[PDB]
Coordinates of C-alpha atoms and ligand atoms in Angstrom, one line a residue:
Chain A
X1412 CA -0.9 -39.3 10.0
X1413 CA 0.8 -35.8 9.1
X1414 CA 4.3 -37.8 8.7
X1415 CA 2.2 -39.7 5.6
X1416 CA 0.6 -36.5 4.3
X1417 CA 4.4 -35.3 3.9
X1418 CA 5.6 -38.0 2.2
X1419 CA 3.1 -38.4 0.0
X1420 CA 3.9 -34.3 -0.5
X1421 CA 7.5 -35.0 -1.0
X1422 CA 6.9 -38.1 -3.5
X1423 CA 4.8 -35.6 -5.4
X1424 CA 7.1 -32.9 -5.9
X1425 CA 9.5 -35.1 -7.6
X1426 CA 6.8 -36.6 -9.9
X1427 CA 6.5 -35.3 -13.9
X1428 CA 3.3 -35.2 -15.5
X1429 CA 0.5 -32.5 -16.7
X1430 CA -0.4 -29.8 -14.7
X1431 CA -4.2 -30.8 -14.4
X1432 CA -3.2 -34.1 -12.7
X1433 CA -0.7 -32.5 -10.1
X1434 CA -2.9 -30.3 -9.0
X1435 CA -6.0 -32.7 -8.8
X1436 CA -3.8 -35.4 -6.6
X1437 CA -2.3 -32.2 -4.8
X1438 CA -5.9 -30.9 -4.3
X1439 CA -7.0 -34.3 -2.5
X1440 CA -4.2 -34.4 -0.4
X1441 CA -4.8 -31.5 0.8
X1442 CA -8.4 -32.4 1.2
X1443 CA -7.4 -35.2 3.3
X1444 CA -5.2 -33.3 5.3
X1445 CA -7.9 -31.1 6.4
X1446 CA -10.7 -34.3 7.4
X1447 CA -7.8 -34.6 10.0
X1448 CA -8.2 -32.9 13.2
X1449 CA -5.7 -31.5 16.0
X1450 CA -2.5 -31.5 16.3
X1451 CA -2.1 -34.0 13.1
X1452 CA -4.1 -31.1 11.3
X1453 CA -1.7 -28.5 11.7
X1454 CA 1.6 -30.4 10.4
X1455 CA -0.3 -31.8 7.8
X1456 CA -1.3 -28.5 6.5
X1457 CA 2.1 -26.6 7.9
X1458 CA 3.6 -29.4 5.6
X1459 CA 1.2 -28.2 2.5
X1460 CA 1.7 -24.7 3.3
X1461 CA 6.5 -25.6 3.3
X1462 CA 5.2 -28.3 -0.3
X1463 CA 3.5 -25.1 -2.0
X1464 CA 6.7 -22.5 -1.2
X1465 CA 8.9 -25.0 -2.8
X1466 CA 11.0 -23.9 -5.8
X1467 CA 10.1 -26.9 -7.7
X1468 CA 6.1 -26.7 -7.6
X1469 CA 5.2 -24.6 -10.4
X1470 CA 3.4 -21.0 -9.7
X1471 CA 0.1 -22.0 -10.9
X1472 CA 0.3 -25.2 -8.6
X1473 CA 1.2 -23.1 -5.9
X1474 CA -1.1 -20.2 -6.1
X1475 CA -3.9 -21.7 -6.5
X1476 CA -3.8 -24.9 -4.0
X1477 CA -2.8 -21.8 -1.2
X1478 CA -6.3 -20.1 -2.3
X1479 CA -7.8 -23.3 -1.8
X1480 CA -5.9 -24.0 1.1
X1481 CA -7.3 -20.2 2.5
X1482 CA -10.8 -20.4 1.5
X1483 CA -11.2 -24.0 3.5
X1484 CA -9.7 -22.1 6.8
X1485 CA -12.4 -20.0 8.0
X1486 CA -14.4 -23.3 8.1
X1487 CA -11.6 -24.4 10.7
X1488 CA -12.3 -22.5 14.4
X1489 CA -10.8 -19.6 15.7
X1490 CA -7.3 -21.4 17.2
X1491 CA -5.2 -24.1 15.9
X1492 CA -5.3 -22.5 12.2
X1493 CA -3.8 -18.9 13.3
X1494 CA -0.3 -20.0 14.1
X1495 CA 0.1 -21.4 10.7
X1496 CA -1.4 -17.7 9.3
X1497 CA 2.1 -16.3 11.1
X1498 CA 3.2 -19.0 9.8
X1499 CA 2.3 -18.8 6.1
X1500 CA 2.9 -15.0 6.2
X1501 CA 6.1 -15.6 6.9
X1502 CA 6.6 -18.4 4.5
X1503 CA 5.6 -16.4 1.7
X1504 CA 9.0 -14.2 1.0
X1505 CA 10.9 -15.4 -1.9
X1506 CA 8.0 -15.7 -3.8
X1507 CA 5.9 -12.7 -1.9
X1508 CA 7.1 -10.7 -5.0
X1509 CA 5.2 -13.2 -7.4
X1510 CA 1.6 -13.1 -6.0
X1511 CA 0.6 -11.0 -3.1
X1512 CA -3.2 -12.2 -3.3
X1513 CA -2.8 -14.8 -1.1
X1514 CA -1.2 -12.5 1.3
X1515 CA -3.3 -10.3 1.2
X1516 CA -6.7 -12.5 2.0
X1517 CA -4.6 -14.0 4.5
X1518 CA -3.5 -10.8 6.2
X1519 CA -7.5 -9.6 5.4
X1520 CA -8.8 -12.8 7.5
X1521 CA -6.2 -12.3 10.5
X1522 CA -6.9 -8.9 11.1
X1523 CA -10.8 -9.4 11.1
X1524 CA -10.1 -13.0 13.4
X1525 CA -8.4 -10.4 15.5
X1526 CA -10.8 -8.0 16.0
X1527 CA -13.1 -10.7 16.4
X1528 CA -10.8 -11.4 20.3
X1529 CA -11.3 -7.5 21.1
X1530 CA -7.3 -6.7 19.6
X1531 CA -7.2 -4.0 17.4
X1532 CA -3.9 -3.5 18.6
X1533 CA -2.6 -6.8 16.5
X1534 CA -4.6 -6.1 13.9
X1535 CA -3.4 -3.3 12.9
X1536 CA -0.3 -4.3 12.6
X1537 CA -1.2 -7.2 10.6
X1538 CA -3.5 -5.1 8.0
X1539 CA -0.2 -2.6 7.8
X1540 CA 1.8 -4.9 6.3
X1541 CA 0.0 -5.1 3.4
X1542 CA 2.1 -3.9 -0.2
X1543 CA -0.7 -1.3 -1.1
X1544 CA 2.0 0.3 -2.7
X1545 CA 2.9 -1.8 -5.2
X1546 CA 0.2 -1.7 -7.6
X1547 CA 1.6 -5.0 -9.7
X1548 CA -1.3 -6.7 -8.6
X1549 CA -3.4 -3.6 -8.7
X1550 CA -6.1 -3.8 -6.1
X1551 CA -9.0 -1.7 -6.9
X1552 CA -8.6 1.5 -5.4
X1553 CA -12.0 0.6 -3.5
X1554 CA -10.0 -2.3 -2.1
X1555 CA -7.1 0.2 -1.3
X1556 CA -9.2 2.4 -0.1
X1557 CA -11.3 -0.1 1.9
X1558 CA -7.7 -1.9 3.5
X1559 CA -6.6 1.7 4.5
X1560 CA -9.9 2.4 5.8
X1561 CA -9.9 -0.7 8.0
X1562 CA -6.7 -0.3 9.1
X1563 CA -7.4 3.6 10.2
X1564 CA -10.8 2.5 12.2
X1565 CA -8.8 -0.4 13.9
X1566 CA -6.2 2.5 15.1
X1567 CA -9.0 4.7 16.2
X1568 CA -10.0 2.0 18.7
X1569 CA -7.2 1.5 20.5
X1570 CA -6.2 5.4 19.7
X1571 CA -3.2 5.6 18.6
X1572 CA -3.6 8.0 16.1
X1573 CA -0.2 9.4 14.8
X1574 CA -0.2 6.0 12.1
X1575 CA -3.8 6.6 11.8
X1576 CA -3.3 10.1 10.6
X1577 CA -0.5 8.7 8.3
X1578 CA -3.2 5.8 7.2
X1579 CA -6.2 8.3 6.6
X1580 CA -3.2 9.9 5.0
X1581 CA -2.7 7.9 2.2
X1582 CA -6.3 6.8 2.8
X1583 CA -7.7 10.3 0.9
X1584 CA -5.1 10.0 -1.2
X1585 CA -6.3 6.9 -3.2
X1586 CA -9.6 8.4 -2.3
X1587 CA -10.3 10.9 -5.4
X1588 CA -10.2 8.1 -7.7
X1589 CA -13.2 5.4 -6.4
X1590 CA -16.4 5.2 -7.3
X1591 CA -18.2 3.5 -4.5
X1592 CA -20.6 6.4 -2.5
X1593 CA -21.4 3.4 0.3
X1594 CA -17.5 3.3 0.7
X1595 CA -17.0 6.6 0.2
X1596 CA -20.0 7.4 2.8
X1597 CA -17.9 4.9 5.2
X1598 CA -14.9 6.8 4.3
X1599 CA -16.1 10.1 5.5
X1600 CA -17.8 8.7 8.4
X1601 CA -14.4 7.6 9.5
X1602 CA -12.6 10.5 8.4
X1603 CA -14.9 12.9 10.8
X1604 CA -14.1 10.3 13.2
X1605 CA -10.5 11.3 12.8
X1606 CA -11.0 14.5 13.1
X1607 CA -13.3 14.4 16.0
X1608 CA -10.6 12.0 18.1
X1609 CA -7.0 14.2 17.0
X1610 CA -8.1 17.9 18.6
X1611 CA -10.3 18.5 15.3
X1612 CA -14.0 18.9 17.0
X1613 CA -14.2 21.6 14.9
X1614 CA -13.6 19.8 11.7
X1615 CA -15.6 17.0 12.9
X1616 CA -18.3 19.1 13.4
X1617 CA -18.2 20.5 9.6
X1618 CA -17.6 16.6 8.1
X1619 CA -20.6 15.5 10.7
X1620 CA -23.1 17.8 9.6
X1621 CA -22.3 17.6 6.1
X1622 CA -22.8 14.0 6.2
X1623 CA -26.0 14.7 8.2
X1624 CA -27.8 16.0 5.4
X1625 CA -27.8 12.6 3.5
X1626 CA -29.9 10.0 2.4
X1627 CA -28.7 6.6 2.5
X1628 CA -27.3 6.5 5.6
X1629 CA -29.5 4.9 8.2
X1630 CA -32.0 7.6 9.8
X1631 CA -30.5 6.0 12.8
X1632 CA -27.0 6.4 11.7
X1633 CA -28.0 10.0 10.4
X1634 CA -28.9 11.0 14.4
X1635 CA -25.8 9.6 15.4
X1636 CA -24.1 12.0 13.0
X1637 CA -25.3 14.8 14.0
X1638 CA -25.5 13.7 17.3
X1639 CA -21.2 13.7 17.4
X1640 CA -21.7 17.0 15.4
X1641 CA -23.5 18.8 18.4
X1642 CA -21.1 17.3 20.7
X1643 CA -17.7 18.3 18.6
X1644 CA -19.6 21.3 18.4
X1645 CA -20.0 21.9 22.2
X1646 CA -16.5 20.5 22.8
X1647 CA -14.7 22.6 20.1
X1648 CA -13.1 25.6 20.7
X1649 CA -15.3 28.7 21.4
X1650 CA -14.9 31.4 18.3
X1651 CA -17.0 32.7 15.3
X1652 CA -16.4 29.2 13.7
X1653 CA -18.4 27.6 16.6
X1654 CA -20.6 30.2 16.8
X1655 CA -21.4 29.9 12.9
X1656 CA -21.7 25.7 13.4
X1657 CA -24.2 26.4 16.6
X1658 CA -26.5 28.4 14.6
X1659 CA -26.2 26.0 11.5
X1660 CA -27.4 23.1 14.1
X1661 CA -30.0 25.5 15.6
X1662 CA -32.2 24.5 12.4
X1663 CA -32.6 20.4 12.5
X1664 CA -35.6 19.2 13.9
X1665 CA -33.6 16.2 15.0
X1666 CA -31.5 18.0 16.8
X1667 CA -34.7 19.0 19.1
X1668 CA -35.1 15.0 18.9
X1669 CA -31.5 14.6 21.0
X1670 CA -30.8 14.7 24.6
X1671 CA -28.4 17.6 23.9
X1672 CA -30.6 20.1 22.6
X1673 CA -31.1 22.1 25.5
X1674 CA -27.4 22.4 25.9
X1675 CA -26.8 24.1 22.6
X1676 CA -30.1 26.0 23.1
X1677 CA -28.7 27.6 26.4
X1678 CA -25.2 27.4 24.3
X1679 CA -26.5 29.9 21.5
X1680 CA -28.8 31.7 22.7
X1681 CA -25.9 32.8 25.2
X1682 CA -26.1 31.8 28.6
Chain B
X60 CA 20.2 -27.4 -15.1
X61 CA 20.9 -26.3 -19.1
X62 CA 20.6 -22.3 -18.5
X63 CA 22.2 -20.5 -15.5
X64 CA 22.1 -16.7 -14.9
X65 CA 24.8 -15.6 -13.8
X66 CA 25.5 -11.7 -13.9
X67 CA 22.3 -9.5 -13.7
X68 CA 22.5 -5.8 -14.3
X69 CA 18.9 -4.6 -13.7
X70 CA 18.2 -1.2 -12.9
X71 CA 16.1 -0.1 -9.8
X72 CA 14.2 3.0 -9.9
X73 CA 13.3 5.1 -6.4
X74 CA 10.8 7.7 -5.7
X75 CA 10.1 9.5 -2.8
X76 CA 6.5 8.2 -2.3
X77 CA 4.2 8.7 1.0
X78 CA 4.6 12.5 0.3
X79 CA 1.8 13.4 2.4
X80 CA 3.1 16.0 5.4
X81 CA 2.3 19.3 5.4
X82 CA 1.6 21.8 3.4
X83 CA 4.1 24.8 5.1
X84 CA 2.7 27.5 4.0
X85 CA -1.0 26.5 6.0
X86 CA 0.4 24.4 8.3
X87 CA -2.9 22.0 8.4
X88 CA -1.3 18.8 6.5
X89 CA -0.7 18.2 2.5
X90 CA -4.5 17.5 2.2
X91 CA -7.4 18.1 3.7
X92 CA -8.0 21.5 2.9
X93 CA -6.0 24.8 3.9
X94 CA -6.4 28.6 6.7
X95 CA -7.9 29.9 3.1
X96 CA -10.2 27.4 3.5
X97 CA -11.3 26.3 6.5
X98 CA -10.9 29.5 8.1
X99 CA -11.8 32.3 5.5
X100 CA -14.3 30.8 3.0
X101 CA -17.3 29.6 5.0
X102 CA -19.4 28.4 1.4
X103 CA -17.0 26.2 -0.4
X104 CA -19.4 25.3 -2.6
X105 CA -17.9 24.3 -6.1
X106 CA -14.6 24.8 -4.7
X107 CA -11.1 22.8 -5.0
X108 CA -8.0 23.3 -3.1
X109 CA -5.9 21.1 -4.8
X110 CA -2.1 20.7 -4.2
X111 CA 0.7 21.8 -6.2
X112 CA 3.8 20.1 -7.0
X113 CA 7.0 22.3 -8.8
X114 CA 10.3 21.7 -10.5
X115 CA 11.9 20.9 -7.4
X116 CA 10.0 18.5 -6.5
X117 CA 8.4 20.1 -3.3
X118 CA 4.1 20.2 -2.5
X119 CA 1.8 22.8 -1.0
X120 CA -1.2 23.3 -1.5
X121 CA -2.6 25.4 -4.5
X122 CA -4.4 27.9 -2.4
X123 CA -1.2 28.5 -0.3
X124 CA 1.6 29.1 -2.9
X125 CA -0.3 31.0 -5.2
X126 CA -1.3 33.3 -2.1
X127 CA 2.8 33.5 -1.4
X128 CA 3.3 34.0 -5.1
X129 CA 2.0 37.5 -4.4
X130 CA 4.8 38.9 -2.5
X131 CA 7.7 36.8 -2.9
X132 CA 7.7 34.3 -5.8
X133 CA 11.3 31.9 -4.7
X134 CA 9.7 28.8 -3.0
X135 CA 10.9 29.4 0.5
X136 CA 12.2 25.9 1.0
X137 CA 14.8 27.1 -1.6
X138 CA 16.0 30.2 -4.0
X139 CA 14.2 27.9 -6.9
X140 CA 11.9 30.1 -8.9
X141 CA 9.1 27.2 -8.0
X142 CA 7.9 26.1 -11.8
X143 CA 4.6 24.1 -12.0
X144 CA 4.8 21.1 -13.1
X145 CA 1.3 19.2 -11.3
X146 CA -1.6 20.4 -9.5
X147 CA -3.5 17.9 -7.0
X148 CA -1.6 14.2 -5.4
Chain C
X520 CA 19.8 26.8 -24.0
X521 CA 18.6 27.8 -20.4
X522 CA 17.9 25.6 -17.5
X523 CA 14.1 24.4 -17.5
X524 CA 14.1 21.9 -20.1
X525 CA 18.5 21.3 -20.2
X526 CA 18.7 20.7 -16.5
X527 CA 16.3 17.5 -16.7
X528 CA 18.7 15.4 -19.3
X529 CA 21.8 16.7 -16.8
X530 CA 20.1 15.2 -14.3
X531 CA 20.1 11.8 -16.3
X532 CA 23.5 11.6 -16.5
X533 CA 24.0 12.7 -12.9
X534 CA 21.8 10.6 -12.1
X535 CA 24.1 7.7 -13.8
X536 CA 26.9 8.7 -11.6
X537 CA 24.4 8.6 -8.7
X538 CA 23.8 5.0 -9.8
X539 CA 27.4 3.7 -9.8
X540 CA 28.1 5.8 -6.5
X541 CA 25.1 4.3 -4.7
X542 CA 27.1 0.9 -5.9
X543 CA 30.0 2.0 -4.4
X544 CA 28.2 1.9 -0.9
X545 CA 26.7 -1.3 -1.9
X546 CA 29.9 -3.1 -3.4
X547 CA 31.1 -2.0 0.1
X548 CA 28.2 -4.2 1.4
X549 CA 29.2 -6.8 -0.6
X550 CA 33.0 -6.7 0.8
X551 CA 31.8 -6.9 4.2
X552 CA 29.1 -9.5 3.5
X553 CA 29.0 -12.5 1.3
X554 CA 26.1 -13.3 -0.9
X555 CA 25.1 -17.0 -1.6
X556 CA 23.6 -18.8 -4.6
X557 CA 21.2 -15.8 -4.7
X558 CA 23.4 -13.2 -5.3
X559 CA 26.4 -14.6 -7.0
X560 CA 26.7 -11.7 -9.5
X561 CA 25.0 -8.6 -9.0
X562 CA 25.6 -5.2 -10.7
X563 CA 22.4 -3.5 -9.4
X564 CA 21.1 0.1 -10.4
X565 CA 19.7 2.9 -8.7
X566 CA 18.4 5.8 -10.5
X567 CA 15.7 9.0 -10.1
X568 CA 12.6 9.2 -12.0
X569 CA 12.7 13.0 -11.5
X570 CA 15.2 12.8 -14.6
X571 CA 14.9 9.5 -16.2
X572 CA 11.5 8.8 -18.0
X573 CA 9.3 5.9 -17.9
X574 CA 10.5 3.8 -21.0
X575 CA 6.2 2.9 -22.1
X576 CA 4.4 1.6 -19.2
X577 CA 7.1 0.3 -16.3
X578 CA 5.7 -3.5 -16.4
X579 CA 4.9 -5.8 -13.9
X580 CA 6.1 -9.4 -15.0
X581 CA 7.7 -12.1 -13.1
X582 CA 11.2 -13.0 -11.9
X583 CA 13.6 -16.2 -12.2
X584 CA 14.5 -17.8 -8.9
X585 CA 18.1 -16.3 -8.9
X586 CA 17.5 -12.9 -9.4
X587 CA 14.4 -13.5 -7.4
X588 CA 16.4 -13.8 -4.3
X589 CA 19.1 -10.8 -5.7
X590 CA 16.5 -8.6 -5.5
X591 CA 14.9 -9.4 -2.9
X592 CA 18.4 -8.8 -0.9
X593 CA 18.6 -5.9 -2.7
X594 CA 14.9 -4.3 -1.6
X595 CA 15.7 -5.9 1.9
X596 CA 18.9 -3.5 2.1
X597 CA 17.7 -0.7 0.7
X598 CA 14.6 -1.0 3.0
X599 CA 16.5 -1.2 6.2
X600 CA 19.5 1.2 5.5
X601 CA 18.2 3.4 2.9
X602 CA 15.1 3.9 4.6
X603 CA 11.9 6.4 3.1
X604 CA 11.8 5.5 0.2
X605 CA 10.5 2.1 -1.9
X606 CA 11.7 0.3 -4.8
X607 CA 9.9 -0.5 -8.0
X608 CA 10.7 -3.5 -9.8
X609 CA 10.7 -3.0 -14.2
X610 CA 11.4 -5.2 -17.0
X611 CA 11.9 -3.1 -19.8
X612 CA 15.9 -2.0 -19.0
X613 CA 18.6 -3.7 -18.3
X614 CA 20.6 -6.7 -20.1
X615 CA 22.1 -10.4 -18.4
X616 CA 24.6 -12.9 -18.5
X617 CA 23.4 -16.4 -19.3
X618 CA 26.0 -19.4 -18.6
X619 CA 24.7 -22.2 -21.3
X620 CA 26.5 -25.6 -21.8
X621 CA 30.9 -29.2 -26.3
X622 CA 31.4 -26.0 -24.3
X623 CA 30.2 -23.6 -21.8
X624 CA 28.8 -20.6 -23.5
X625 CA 27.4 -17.6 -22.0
X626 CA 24.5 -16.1 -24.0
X627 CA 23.3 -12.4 -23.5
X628 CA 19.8 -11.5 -22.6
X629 CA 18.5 -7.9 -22.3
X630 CA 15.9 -8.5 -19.2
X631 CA 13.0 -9.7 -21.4
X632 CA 14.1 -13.2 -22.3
X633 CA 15.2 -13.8 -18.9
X634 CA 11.6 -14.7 -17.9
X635 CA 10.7 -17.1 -21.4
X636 CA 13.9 -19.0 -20.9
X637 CA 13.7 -20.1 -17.1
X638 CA 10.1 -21.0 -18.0
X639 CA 12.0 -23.1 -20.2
X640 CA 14.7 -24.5 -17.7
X641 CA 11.3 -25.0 -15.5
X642 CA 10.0 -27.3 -18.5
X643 CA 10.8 -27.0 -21.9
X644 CA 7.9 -27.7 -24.8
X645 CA 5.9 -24.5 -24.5
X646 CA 4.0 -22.5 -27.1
X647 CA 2.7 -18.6 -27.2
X648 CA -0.4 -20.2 -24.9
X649 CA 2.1 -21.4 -22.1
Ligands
ZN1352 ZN1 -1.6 24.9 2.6
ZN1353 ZN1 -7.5 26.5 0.1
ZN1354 ZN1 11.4 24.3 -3.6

């Protein structure tokens, strides 16, 4: 019954009235789009998706009915409704310019469906393409900083860094202007991640045990710190810098708690 | 329709954004610190090590120029005599 | 006078030459390819805001279907051929030609009616509200 949800579409486009009625009729066709199922599912909502990018429906109409058309998606499993994602990114492009916050949660809920399948690869790519830059619609800098920071953690799985380094990049650079400490505790979590993947075990090291020495990071999370700090340590190049970083992690009493604490013990002490 | 545009002579304004690179002098990156920094100074306790952008347009960071400012004081990129017009990104 | 502050307004006006000679390698776009309906008219600027200053606040507002599609041919090009560096899109400069219709008429506004009056060939009957 998609060829019925279009006409009814197309017979509504040409209609006049107030903009509480359009949308309202609009509204519960696209409700009764989405009680179908399959195949008739997805051209009835590919045919929303080509009604709402139409010149003649008016902005409001549009943005608004796309939001509502988003938020009733992740409700719909993970299949059928991610060629029409490609296929709404795409859609939105002579009107991209005129909101990007549809975009932008679409783009938000591909890339996390993706790394739902194990493909940081594709999500990546999908997160990249969001206009950060713009600043029209002026996401937060927490969102710009949280988007960047996704987009630098879904490089660091697959490793392939030289973006990543460009996304932590522009990452810091929004970064002096948040407010969030949980965000900017994730930030430099990630950021000594960075580090510690590049060649920078040294760095890592630093950024670890700095963040090792706080107090709302999970006591479990706060091993694992400084549990990558004793490794970068080990790992990093040996010179007075390490030497300075093994004595500094010669003092926790976790550090006694970790596998590794003979290692630097032999490690310092000189063996 | 009643009103048709026609002509449009709109002006569009470039900048040359992602500036993050490296700073030359340190050779680290723009950011993240500089060798006065994370090789000299071990503290860096209510420090900074901000970036610095000139007349011409080019970035280091603050530590590093002001350090080359000692000897030679022409912006090595360039025989500019390297106003400053912004400190940090 | 000397150079520091001098050398920034003679970088304006280069910068106007830099604008009509960045046209030149765009109207030789436009020889080679033909624009449609979006695109019909375009005498687009380019200029650098290492010279020129922000007029108050560089504003974000919205675009009539026409020059929608113009500049989004324009951003498109400059994207792919002029790549590293990014476009920002203003309202407060600029001027255009507006073909009314007993004759045909072509009013004049400076790029800040442009946006009232296509809401107006959207729907007329509007108020401060709308
Ligand atoms: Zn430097
Ligand atoms: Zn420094
Ligand atoms: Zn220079």
């Amino acid at each position: 019954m998609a060829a019925a949800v279009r006409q009814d579409l197309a017979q509504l486009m040409n209609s006049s009235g107030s903009h509480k009625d359009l949308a309202g009729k609009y509204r519960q066709i696209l409700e009764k789009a989405i009680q179908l199922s399959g195949a008739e599912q997805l051209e009835a909502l590919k045919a929303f998706v080509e009604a709402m990018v139409n010149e003649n429906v008016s902005l409001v109409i549009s943005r608004q009915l796309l939001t509502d058309f988003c938020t009733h998606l992740p409700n719909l499993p993970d299949s059928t409704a991610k060629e029409i994602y490609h296929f709404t990114l795409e859609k939105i492009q002579p009107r991209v310019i005129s909101f990007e916050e549809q975009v932008a949660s679409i783009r938000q809920h591909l890339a996390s469906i993706y790394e739902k399948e194990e493909d940081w690869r594709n999500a990546a790519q999908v997160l990249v393409g969001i206009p950060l830059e713009t600043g029209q619609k002026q996401y937060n800098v927490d969102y710009k900083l949280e988007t960047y920071l996704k987009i630098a953690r879904l490089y660091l799985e697959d490793d392939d860094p030289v973006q990543a380094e460009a996304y932590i990049n522009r990452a810091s650079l929004l970064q002096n202007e948040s407010t969030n400490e949980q965000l900017q505790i994730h930030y430099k979590v990630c950021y000594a991640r960075v580090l510690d993947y590049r060649r920078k075990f040294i760095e890592a090291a630093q950024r670890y045990n700095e963040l090792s020495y706080k107090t709302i990071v999970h006591e479990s999370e706060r091993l694992e710190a400084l549990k990558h700090a004793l490794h970068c340590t080990i790992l990093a190049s040996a010179g007075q810098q390490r030497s300075r970083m093994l004595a500094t992690l010669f003092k926790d009493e976790r550090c006694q708690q970790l596998a590794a604490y003979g290692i630097l013990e032999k490690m310092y002490l000189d063996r | 329709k009643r009103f048709e545009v026609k002509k449009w002579n709109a002006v569009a304004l470039w900048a040359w954004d992602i500036v993050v690179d490296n700073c030359a002098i340190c050779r680290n990156h723009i950011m993240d610190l500089c060798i006065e920094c994370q090789a000299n100074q071990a503290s860096a306790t209510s420090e900074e090590c901000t970036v610095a952008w000139g007349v011409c347009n080019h970035a280091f960071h603050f530590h590093c120029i002001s350090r080359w400012l000692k000897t030679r004081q022409v912006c090595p990129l360039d025989n500019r005599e390297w106003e400053f017009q912004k400190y940090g990104h | 006078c000397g150079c520091q502050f001098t050398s920034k307004l003679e970088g304006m006006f280069r910068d106007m030459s830099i604008s009509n000679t960045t046209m030149d390698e765009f109207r030789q776009h436009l020889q080679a390819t033909g624009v449609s309906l979006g695109g019909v008219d375009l005498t687009v600027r380019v200029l650098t805001t290492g010279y020129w200053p922000t007029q108050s606040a560089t504003p974000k507002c919205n675009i009539p279907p026409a020059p929608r599609h113009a500049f989004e041919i324009f951003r498109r090009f400059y994207l792919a051929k002029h790549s590293g560096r990014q476009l920002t899109l203003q309202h407060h400069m600029g001027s255009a030609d507006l073909n009314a219709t007993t004759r045909k008429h072509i009013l004049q506004v400076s790029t800040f009616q442009m946006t009232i009056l296509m809401l107006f060939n959207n729907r007329e009957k509007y108020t401060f509200e709308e």
